[PDB]
Amino acid sequence: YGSWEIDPKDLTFLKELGTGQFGVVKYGKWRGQYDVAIKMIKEGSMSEDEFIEEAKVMMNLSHEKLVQLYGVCTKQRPIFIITEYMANGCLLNYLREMRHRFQTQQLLEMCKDVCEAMEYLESKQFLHRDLAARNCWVNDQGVVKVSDFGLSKFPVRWSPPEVLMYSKFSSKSDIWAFGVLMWEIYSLGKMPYERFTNSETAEHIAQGLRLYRPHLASEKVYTIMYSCWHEKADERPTFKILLSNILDVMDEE
Numbered sequence: 001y002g003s004w005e006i007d008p009k010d011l012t013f014l015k016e017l018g019t020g021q022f023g024v025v026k027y028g029k030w031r032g033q034y035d036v037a038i039k040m041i042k043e044g045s046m047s048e049d050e051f052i053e054e055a056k057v058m059m060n061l062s063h064e065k066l067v068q069l070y071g072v073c074t075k076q077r078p079i080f081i082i083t084e085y086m087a088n089g090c091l092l093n094y095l096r097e098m099r100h101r102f103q104t105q106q107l108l109e110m111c112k113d114v115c116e117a118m119e120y121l122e123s124k125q126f127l128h129r130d131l132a133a134r135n136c137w138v139n140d141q142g143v144v145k146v147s148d149f150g151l152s153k154f155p156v157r158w159s160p161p162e163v164l165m166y167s168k169f170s171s172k173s174d175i176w177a178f179g180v181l182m183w184e185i186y187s188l189g190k191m192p193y194e195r196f197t198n199s200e201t202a203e204h205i206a207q208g209l210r211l212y213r214p215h216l217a218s219e220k221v222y223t224i225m226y227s228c229w230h231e232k233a234d235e236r237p238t239f240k241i242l243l244s245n246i247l248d249v250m251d252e253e
């Protein structure tokens with residue numbers, strides 16, 4: 001895999017971070033110096049084809065607000081995937097467990113971080129398809145970054161009506177999910193539509209129901225997230241407009 005191939009001899013394992021669909025992830029060091037997350041891909045947990053896929057995406061997209069792949073170990077089994085270390089873990093857990101670290105000013109900056117990542121993906125004509133707090137990560141500085149773009153149990157609660165009825169995915173379905181993610185952020189990690197099932201949610205949003213304004217969201221912040229849920233996809237903003245909107249509110253906060 002060219003200069004993306006890392007010598008497993010240069011890795012050292014320090015702490016276990018947990019187990020996901022594809023196996024154990026550990027925190028470690030690369031070449032004695034760099035903090036890394038090491039994903040030990042469980043054999044059979046994923047096909048060769050599925051890995052060529054993931055690798056293609058990860059070595060060809062790069063941005064300060066996307067979790068950065070550092071390399072792969074493919075000359076043995078199990079495969080290792082080595083990525084940027086996100087010391088504060090998943091954003092969803094962060095919102096629920098680390099509330100002493102942020103105020104509403106920081107909640108908005110979390111949204112701006114994600115919005116920059118998605119404006120970049122939009123500029124590359126690349127759809128995330130599962131944007132949500134569970135797929136955002138927080139580093140030691142509190143910076144939020146997006147991961148697992150295009151890796152796609154269906155994320156009904158983050159989906160617009162045209163996805164649920166027609167499988168019509170576009171930049172505008174990522175916009176919708178981004179609105180829901182801002183709702184997750186300002187609700188400090190509640191499940192969207194927390195009293196409804198998935199099936200109830202799909203019927204309700206088709207009939208025009210929308211997520212209420214979280215108490216920590218100002219009217220101006222709510223206007224931004226609400227603009228993401230226009231029933232007509234072509235009336236939803238772009239991520240570049242959203243970013244401009246968010247910066248304006250941070251300047252007024």
Ligand SMILES: NC(=O)c1ncc(N2CCCCC2)nc1Nc1ccc(C2CCNCC2)cc1
Pocket residue numbers: 017018019020021025037067083084085086087088089090137
């Ligand atoms: N890129 C990364 O840094 C990273 N990638 C994947 C991943 N996963 C994948 C799914 C299985 C769970 C771990 N975890 C990662 N970092 C990570 C970092 C810190 C924690 C702490 C946070 C505080 N409380 C204790 C735990 C947990 C996880």
